[PDB]
Amino acid sequence: ALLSFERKYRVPGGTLVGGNLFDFWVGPFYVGFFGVATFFFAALGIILIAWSAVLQGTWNPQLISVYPPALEYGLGGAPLAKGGLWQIITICATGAFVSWALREVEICRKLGIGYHIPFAFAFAILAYLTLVLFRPVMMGAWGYAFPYGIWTHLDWVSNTGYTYGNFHYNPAHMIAISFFFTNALALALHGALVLSAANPEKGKEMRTPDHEDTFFRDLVGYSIGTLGIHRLGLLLSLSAVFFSALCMIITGTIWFDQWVDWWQWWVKLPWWANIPGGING
Amino acid sequence: DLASLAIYSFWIFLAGLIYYLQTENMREGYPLENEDGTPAANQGPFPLPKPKTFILPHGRGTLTVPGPESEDRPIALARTAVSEGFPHAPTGDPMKDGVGPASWVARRDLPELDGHGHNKIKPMKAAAGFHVSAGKNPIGLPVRGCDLEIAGKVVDIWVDIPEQMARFLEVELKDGSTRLLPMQMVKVQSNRVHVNALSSDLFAGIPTIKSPTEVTLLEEDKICGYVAGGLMYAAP
Amino acid sequence: AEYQNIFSQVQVRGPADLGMTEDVNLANRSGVGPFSTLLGWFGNAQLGPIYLGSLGVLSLFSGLMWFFTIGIWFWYQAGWNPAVFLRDLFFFSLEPPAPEYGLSFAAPLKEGGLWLIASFFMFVAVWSWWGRTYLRAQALGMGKHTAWAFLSAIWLWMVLGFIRPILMGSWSEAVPYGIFSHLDWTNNFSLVHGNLFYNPFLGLSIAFLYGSALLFAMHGATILAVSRFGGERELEQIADRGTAAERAALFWRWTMGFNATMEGIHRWAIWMAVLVTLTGGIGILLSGTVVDNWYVWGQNHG
Ligand code: BCL
Ligand code: BCL
Ligand code: BCL
Ligand SMILES: CC[C@H]1c2cc3[nH]c4c(c3C)C(=O)[C@H](C(=O)OC)c4c3nc(cc4[nH]c(cc(n2)[C@@H]1C)c(C(C)=O)c4C)[C@@H](C)[C@@H]3CCC(=O)OC/C=C(\C)CCC[C@H](C)CCC[C@H](C)CCCC(C)C
Ligand SMILES: CC[C@H]1c2cc3[nH]c4c(c3C)C(=O)[C@H](C(=O)OC)c4c3nc(cc4[nH]c(cc(n2)[C@@H]1C)c(C(C)=O)c4C)[C@@H](C)[C@@H]3CCC(=O)OC/C=C(\C)CCC[C@H](C)CCC[C@H](C)CCCC(C)C
Ligand SMILES: CC[C@H]1c2cc3[nH]c4c(c3C)C(=O)[C@H](C(=O)OC)c4c3nc(cc4[nH]c(cc(n2)[C@@H]1C)c(C(C)=O)c4C)[C@@H](C)[C@@H]3CCC(=O)OC/C=C(\C)CCC[C@H](C)CCC[C@H](C)CCCC(C)C
Ligand SMILES: COC(C)(C)C/C=C/C(C)=C/C=C/C(C)=C/C=C/C(C)=C\C=C\C=C(C)\C=C\C=C(/C)CC/C=C(\C)CCC=C(C)C
Ligand SMILES: [Cl-]
Ligand SMILES: [Fe+3]
Numbered sequence: 001a002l003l004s005f006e007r008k009y010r011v012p013g014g015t016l017v018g019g020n021l022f023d024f025w026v027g028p029f030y031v032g033f034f035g036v037a038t039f040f041f042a043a044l045g046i047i048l049i050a051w052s053a054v055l056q057g058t059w060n061p062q063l064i065s066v067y068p069p070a071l072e073y074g075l076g077g078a079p080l081a082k083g084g085l086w087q088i089i090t091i092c093a094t095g096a097f098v099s100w101a102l103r104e105v106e107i108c109r110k111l112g113i114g115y116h117i118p119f120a121f122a123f124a125i126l127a128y129l130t131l132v133l134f135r136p137v138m139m140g141a142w143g144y145a146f147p148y149g150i151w152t153h154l155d156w157v158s159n160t161g162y163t164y165g166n167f168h169y170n171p172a173h174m175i176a177i178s179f180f181f182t183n184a185l186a187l188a189l190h191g192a193l194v195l196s197a198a199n200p201e202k203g204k205e206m207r208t209p210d211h212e213d214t215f216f217r218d219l220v221g222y223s224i225g226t227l228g229i230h231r232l233g234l235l236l237s238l239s240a241v242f243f244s245a246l247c248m249i250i251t252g253t254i255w256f257d258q259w260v261d262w263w264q265w266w267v268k269l270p271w272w273a274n275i276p277g278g279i280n281g
Numbered sequence: 282d283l284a285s286l287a288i289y290s291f292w293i294f295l296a297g298l299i300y301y302l303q304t305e306n307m308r309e310g311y312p313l314e315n316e317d318g319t320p321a322a323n324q325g326p327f328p329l330p331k332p333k334t335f336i337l338p339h340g341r342g343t344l345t346v347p348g349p350e351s352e353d354r355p356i357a358l359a360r361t362a363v364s365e366g367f368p369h370a371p372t373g374d375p376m377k378d379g380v381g382p383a384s385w386v387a388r389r390d391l392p393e394l395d396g397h398g399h400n401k402i403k404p405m406k407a408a409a410g411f412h413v414s415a416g417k418n419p420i421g422l423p424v425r426g427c428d429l430e431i432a433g434k435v436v437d438i439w440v441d442i443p444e445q446m447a448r449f450l451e452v453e454l455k456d457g458s459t460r461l462l463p464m465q466m467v468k469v470q471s472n473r474v475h476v477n478a479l480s481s482d483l484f485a486g487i488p489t490i491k492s493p494t495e496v497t498l499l500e501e502d503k504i505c506g507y508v509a510g511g512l513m514y515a516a517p
Numbered sequence: 518a519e520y521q522n523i524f525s526q527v528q529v530r531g532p533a534d535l536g537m538t539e540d541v542n543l544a545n546r547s548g549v550g551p552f553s554t555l556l557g558w559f560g561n562a563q564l565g566p567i568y569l570g571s572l573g574v575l576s577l578f579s580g581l582m583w584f585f586t587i588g589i590w591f592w593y594q595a596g597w598n599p600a601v602f603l604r605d606l607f608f609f610s611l612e613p614p615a616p617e618y619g620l621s622f623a624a625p626l627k628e629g630g631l632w633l634i635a636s637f638f639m640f641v642a643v644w645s646w647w648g649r650t651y652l653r654a655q656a657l658g659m660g661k662h663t664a665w666a667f668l669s670a671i672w673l674w675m676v677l678g679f680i681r682p683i684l685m686g687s688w689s690e691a692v693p694y695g696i697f698s699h700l701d702w703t704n705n706f707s708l709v710h711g712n713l714f715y716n717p718f719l720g721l722s723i724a725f726l727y728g729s730a731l732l733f734a735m736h737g738a739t740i741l742a743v744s745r746f747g748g749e750r751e752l753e754q755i756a757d758r759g760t761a762a763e764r765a766a767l768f769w770r771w772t773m774g775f776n777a778t779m780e781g782i783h784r785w786a787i788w789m790a791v792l793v794t795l796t797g798g799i800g801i802l803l804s805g806t807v808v809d810n811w812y813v814w815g816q817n818h819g
Binding site: 003005006009025027028029030103104107108111112113114115116117119120121123124154158166168169180183184185186187188189190191192193194195196197198199200201204206207208209210211212213214215217218219220221222223224225226227228229230231232233234235236237238240241263266267269271272273275277278279280281 | 521522523524534536537539541546547550556559560561563564565566567568594595596598600601602603604605607608609649650653654655656657658659660661662663665666667669670700701703704712714726729730731732733734735736737738739740741742743744745749750751752755756763764765766767768770771772774775776780783784785786787788789790791793
């Protein structure tokens with residue numbers, strides 16, 4: 001049940017709520033007040049989903065799908081069978097995510113390390129909240145949120161995207177994709193670098209961070225460093241999700257026309273707006 | 282059809298890959314133990330991987346993992362419950378005993394060497410060419426504790442030469458002796474260096490180093506573990 | 518306010534680092550460049566030196582040729598008017614030869630000829646740079662991890678503009694050199710193939726793309742969380758585990774039930790990333806060559 005070097009860290013303290021009432025582990029899992037909180041929200045939410053499965057007539061994972069209330073209902077309550085379960089489950093989901101982050105904070109205090117992880121996680125929770133709460137409220141109806149279903153939610157993406165033409169033209173969607181692409185590139189390099197140093201040519205001796213820095217300067221003429229690479233990855237990640245939430249928060253709110261047309265502000269600038277020739281003339 | 286073949290093959294591949302990956306991450310901390318240091322009943326579904334050996338860079342030897350694990354230090358802790366799963370309370374001074382958030386591990390009592398075999402970290406006074414090139418220079422600044430009391434003043438910066446980076450601040454205490462403070466735990470302000478993790482009466486407890494011009498992996502761990510433990514233990 | 522260690526609070530400089538010498542031909546390393554105080558706040562302040570061997574120049578040369586080839590065409594299209602050039606910058610496009618010419622090389626310049634030229638320059642620029650990546654690791658005695666990972670990305674690239682266009686029978690099947698162009702091509706490729714979301718490989722590819730961000734966010738944050746115990750010196754923590762490696766692992770064990778090792782986490786990292794383009798290349802390679810409609814295929818797998 002314990003890692004060879006674990007006992008020394010399993011000391012009392014660090015809890016945010018309830019003192020030492022829930023200060024304990026179950027197997028490897030820590031259980032704070034929030035350990036209990038998330039279980040409560042998750043059990044409930046899984047129950048409501050099972051119950052929504054019956055009302056629908058399937059027990060097939062590829063088929064089950066909880067839909068939000070129809071547009072007619074605007075931002076109000078709705079019958080369980082027609083958008084209500086979705087609303088309650090959304091609350092439970094939100095309760096389960098926020099609790100998990102808070103539980104991570106408590107684990108951070110007991111171990112005496114920084115709070116970067118719970119902090120990073122918050123960005124994901126935020127993207128989720130933009131889709132099921134922020135955008136819908138700003139648009140006037142819970143009907144704009146995505147349905148909870150393995151394929152039905154991809155339908156939402158597809159349809160919502162095509163509602164504004166080729167979504168590729170959303171400018172904030174371009175930034176977002178760039179960060180996602182870049183973060184993967186960066187992750188591939190970081191993992192390969194450290195590994196090629198710890199596992200040098202057959203029989204040779206373990207390389208050093210000096211070699212790591214050398215390899216990169218040789219290659220591209222610059223090395224961000226061991227501390228820099230981790231600051232970078234964290235940043236590329238959080239930025240990718242930040243621009244994602246952002247490209248959506250503006251779609252259907254301050255901009256509801258074709259995204260491709262948004263680009264005329266540039267082509268139609270006074271100066272070149274009239275010159276003949278080119279693609280736009 | 283071909284596509285069906287491809288995707289099915291892939292899932293089998295992916296299962297082997299995850300197996301490999303998981304066993305590879307068991308080269309440390311395993312096998313599992315009971316709260317009493319005894320080998321746990323079930324170790325899970327994955328078996329320990331076949332040992333691998335690292336050839337350390339400067340005649341410093343060999344490393345083989347997985348291998349016999351053992352806290353090569355005493356642990357001043359005592360059970361608080363009659364069953365597995367509960368906190369273990371410190372029997373003495375958690376800070377002084379090195380437990381909980383103030384824990385340290387028995388790393389080699391040697392210093393880390395750069396690619397050429399030289400001490401990776403040196404006081405800046407002994408590193409020719411090095412100087413503060415940007416940001417407030419902390420040297421000469423008084424250091425304050427979480428209790429808003431002054432506990433000393435910075436007298437030097439220990440730097441990472443191959444990575445040209447600040448790692449510790451050498452601080453002189455009223456008794457005339459010095460201690461190292463990790464760079465990541467201090468706040469450099471315009472007219473002073475602030476340290477939250479510790480209160481003024483705790484700087485003296487900070488572990489001290491053998492040689493005045495070098496730190497060993499073992500000493501870094503005791504120093505850092507100590508000041509991080511203050512967050513919890515210095516709290517009052 | 519507690520210190521987060523996202524930006525350094527004090528910068529420290531010393532003499533330029535000429536770097537490790539191994540079986541490296543020091544004759545091919547340039548001189549150090551200036552020091553950036555700006556970059557210094559985030560990572561290393563030192564720029565250069567860089568190693569330029571024969572392959573580097575080869576790669577770097579054809580790399581510009583490819584770039585310039587496309588650029589004169591964009592200018593040809595802009596009527597050499599620097600105003601137009603800028604206005605319609607994202608609209609220009611060097612398209613591949615018409616489907617008429619198939620996999621031939623007899624297409625006239627203003628009809629796909631330049632495309633072939635440019636593609637050829639790109640072909641050697643990328644492959645020579647791949648070789649560069651391998652030799653640079655050999656000269657320092659390091660493993661070839663970077664070369665094998667880079668090969669994964671090359672895979673998707675090879676499928677998009679080479680392998681698939683050949684199995685289909687025409688260079689018209691390839692991707693055009695243009696900004697908005699290749700965006701339309703993408704949207705279009707999906708439509709023509711029955712909606713790419715029904716392709717199981719796009720789905721895996723997405724999973725790993727999202728996984729790469731999940732992981733790096735997790736990893737970067739963890740290391741910064743334990744940098745107060747010198748967590749970033751990952752190599753020494755691998756040889757002599759410290760408290761940084763222990764609390765890092767324990768944080769994740771107490772959170773999700775399992776953990777990794779200082780070395781192990783990097784094996785997770787290289788594969789999560791590599792699988793994005795590995796899974797993706799297969800998905801695209803099978804599109805149009807073996808499967809014509811993913812919706813249909815999905816209806817009865819086969
Ligand atoms: C995978 C499916 C599609 C595809 C779909 C998309 C989609 C969808 C989007 C892009 C976008 C981009 N694509 Mg693409 N793209 C494909 C294949 C390519 C090929 C090559 C295959 O072999 C390349 C080089 C590119 C390159 C690019 C970039 C120009 C741009 C993303 C920036 C980035 O962070 O890149 C990651 C790489 C790095 C960080 C390292 C190298 C530095 C890069 C090249 C810097 C580019 C700067 C850019 C030109 C600046 C414009 C602003 C200036 C003021 C004019 N694509 C395939 C065919 N691509 C995004 C965009 O904004 O497009 C307009 C976008 O939304
Ligand atoms: C055909 C449709 C359109 C299109 C329509 C859309 C639409 C519509 C949306 C996106 C969004 C995104 N698109 Mg798009 N997109 C298109 C084409 C592309 C292409 C391409 C190469 O062609 C690319 C790279 C992208 C890329 C992207 C991403 C930048 C972004 C989604 C990531 C995200 O927000 O994560 C954020 C992460 C989350 C929301 C997850 C949060 C996780 C939560 C907190 C935890 C869950 C825990 C779970 C329940 C626990 C399980 C426990 C078990 C024990 C495991 N798109 C086409 C042109 N795209 C989305 C976006 O920007 O969203 C904000 C979005 O809404
Ligand atoms: C970001 C923009 C869109 C979106 C666009 C897409 C697109 C496009 C695709 C997916 C795909 C997936 N999406 Mg999504 N998805 C969105 C929001 C969510 C939310 C949420 C709480 O908001 C969740 C749980 C999911 C979950 C999922 C997975 C079922 C599947 C991806 C595997 C993966 O590796 O993911 C990355 C995460 C990890 C690698 C970490 C491990 C987490 C595991 C995989 C989670 C499993 C969840 C399980 C299936 C659901 C349990 C729910 C029960 C009630 C407990 N999405 C938003 C609305 N999603 C892919 C697919 O194949 O779909 C069929 C796909 O192509
Ligand atoms: C910069 C943001 C990036 C990021 C970071 C991130 N994710 C994180 C963390 C961090 C730093 C964690 O610490 C945390 C973790 O512990 O990971 C192991 C986590 C995590 N990221 C996760 C998923 C995840 N992250 C994603 C993305 C990202 N995570 C970003 C790329 C995605 C995508 C791209 O889709 C997913 C699926 C979880 C595995 C894990 C958090 C687990 C958690 O909070 O668990 C407790 C919650 C439950 C048990 C909830 C169940 C509730 C009910 C059963 C109802 C379900 C409702 C839901 C709406 C159904 C959806 C169905 C779908 C088919 C649509
Ligand atoms: C797992 C797959 C992921 C991945 C991995 C990956 N990429 C890699 C590697 C790896 C492992 C490398 O080793 C390699 C590298 O060297 O990285 C630093 C690389 C690389 N990934 C690159 C790009 C890239 N990767 C991408 C993606 C991905 N890479 C995936 C997410 C993308 C996207 C998202 O589309 C792009 C654009 C390259 C930057 C780089 C390989 C460089 C290369 O092939 O170069 C040939 C050289 C040229 C074309 C030189 C000319 C360049 C410019 C056109 C001119 C302007 C600059 C020039 C310096 C000016 C000179 C002026 C003179 C007057 C002096
Ligand atoms: C409307 C269009 C639909 C679509 C299409 C689509 N997606 C695609 C493709 C296509 C046609 C791919 O080919 C690609 C793929 O691999 O698919 C299997 C992909 C993909 N879609 C993804 C995600 C995705 N797609 C989505 C959607 C859609 N994709 C739409 C439904 C979504 C959502 C949320 O809706 C997501 C998250 C990725 C997993 C994957 C794409 C590839 C990727 O991220 O690649 C990075 C790597 C490369 C492009 C590597 C080649 C690198 C070269 C070797 C380097 C270039 C060299 C040059 C010298 C650089 C010079 C730089 C200068 C600055 C110097
Ligand atoms: C400022 O003005 C100057 C003149 C200085 C420069 C101007 C240039 C500009 C402004 C250039 C802009 C270029 C842009 C925006 C290019 C964008 C390219 C993009 C977005 C995508 C590229 C996709 C291409 C991939 C899929 C290509 C793959 C190619 C291959 C695999 C090679 C295939 C090779 C072939 C067919 C022939 C060679 C044959 C062999 C095997 C020997
Ligand atoms: Cl020398
Ligand atoms: Fe790392």
